[PDB]
Every structure is written in structure tokens, then in C-alpha cells.
């Protein structure tokens, strides 16, 4: 659909059999979610943002349903303050910025 | 313009006569720029990011040109890893998320 920016661009996602709420963040290269259990092996990684770095666990080839939209891609799990859907999966669902 | 996200959504801003590179970020509510001087008095503000909170310098009614569009609102100045343009100014340029 079309999303205006008067409010935070919050969407519901589905992952690991858990329905969740996320932020569509176009400034994020990656997708970071609050702590959770995902299947398969993961690697430790460090991602920075406003505030500095947080250690995260990186899961690859993950299926996510955003706005009833399937998408597969890398997902990082860690001590994030908020769930954030990055460009990494935003491209996959054809998201653009218009103005 | 219509901006895709396979690349960072970097744009050129004109701020205080200087051209700068900023990021269009729907995930941020406010505009946070790298350390720089600006006119007037500033109020203090604490902002939370992915990796923690940071104090910043709040500046109101600042003139910022983003891709030719003229905006005038609040600008946070602080230790940010990158110049970020938030919802406060995106709503001003009439920026939406499409899909
Ligand atoms: C201005 C703060 C808002 C925000 C955090 C979001 C938030 C929203 C509501 C409540 C709580 C938190 C959103 C934002 O886009 C990021 C950024 C960097 C600008 C961000 C977000 C997610 C991941 C990262 N790590 S990264 O490797 O994907 C990365 C690293 C750097 C860049 C750069 F282009 F921003 F430098 C972008 N992405 C960074 C952030 O660090 O804080």
C-alpha cells in the first residue's frame, strides 16, 4: 500500500511462528529483531547505529512475511530496543521511497 | 523522485550553505546530523538508537534543503555515525513508503 510518515511506519511481521510488530526503516542496511529463537546455525556479528554497537546473532536464508508479503533473507537477533525491518528485506517486497 | 533501496538512500542536503550527504530514514522520528555549528540557542535532548542513548543539541526552525525541496524544522546535532533525515522532515517534503 502507500505509507505516509505522520506516524511510525509500523507493520506486523511473521517469523519463527511468532507474529510481531516492526518498523520499516530505510536507513538500516540490515534487519534486526529483539531476542528470539531461530532454527539453524548463526554467526556472531557486530552492527552499529545511533548509540554504538550491539552484538547480534546472524541467521541467513530466513523466511519473513511482512504485510502478507513473503521474503527470505538475513536476519540478526540481538539486544535491539526495537524490531527493525531493513533494506535487506525491504527490497524483496518492492518497497520504494517517493516524494 | 522514486527511490529504491538496493543502495543506501543517500541524498544531498543544503544546510547552512554547505552541501552534505544524508540518509533518508523512515525509522527515525527526528533528524540527527553529524557535529556542526548552527545559528541560535539549542536545547538538550537524549535520543535512543539501536545501540544506546546519546545526548544531542536540539535546534529549532532550521533551514534544510533536501533534494531541492525546502524544509524548516528541528535538527538534532550529535555524535551520529551518519547524517540521518527523519520523519519530521520527510513528512515535510511529502515522503511516503510505497509497495
Ligand atoms: C535515529 C534513531 C533511530 C534508529 C533506531 C530505531 C529505533 C526506532 C524506534 C525505537 C527504537 C529504535 C533507526 C535507524 O535507522 C538506525 C540506524 C543507523 C542510521 C540502524 C538501524 C538498524 C540497524 C543498524 N546496523 S546496520 O549494520 O544495519 C547499519 C549500519 C550503518 C548504516 C548507516 F548507513 F546508517 F550508517 C545503516 N545500517 C543501524 C538507528 O540506529 O537508530
B71 touches A at CB < 8 Å: no
Nearest alpha carbon to residue B85 among B29, B45, B40, B37: B29
Strands in A96-98's sheet, in edge-to-edge order, are: A2-3, B96-98, A96-98, B2-3
CA separation for the pair B5, B58 (Å, rounded): 29
Q: How many domains, chain B?
A: 1
Choose the residue to mutate in A45, A49, A83 for probing ligand 1, maximizing ligand atoms within 8 Å of C-beta: A49
Range of the domain at B97: 1-99
Going by CA atoms, what residue is nearest to atom 17 of ligand 1?
Answer: A49
User: Are residues A97 and B26, on separate chains, in Cβ contact within 8 Å?
Assistant: yes
Contacts of B27 (CB under 8 A, 6+ apart): A8, A9, A23, A24, A25, A26, A27, A28, A84
B2/chain A closest Cα distance in angstroms: 5
Contacts of A31 (CB under 8 A, 6+ apart): A64, A73, A74, A75, A76, A84, A85, A86, A88, A89
Q: Strands A32-34, A70-78: parallel, antiparallel or unpaired by DSSP?
A: parallel
A39 touches B at CB < 8 Å: no
> How many angstroms is it from A76 CA to the middle of ligand 1?
13
B25 catalytic? Reply is: yes
CA separation for the pair B38, B64 (Å, rounded): 12
User: Is the CB of residue A84 less than 8 Å from the CB of residue A20?
Assistant: no
Going by CA atoms, what residue is nearest to atom 41 of ligand 1?
Answer: A49
CA separation for the pair A51, B82 (Å, rounded): 12
User: Is the CB of residue A91 less than 8 Å from the CB of residue B6?
Assistant: yes
Nearest alpha carbon to residue A99 among B67, B62, B20: B67
> How many angstroms is it from B49 CA to the middle of ligand 1?
7
For A90, the 3-state DSSP assignment is: helix
Nearest alpha carbon to residue A43 among A89, A78, A88, A85: A78
CA separation for the pair B95, A27 (Å, rounded): 14
List alpha helices for chain B, DSSP H. 87-93
User: Are residues A26 and B47, on separate chains, in Cβ contact within 8 Å?
Assistant: no
CATH number reported for the structural domain that contains residue A75 in this entry: 2.40.70.10
Q: Experimental technique used?
A: X-ray
Q: Strands A32-34, A18-24: parallel, antiparallel or unpaired by DSSP?
A: unpaired
Amino acid at each position: 500500500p502507500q505509507i505516509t510518515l505522520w506516524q511510525r511506519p509500523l507493520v506486523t511481521i511473521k517469523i519463527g511462528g511468532q507474529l510481531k510488530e516492526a518498523l520499516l526503516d530505510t536507513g538500516a542496511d540490515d534487519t534486526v529483531l529483539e531476542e528470539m529463537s531461530l532454527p539453524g546455525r548463526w554467526k556472531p556479528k557486530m552492527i552499529g547505529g545511533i548509540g554504538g554497537f550491539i552484538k547480534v546473532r546472524q541467521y541467513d536464508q530466513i523466511l519473513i512475511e511482512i504485510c502478507g508479503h513473503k521474503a527470505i533473507g538475513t536476519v540478526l537477533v540481538g539486544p535491539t530496543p526495537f524490531n527493525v525491518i531493513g533494506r535487506n528485506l525491504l527490497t524483496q517486497i518492492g518497497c520504494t521511497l517517493n516524494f
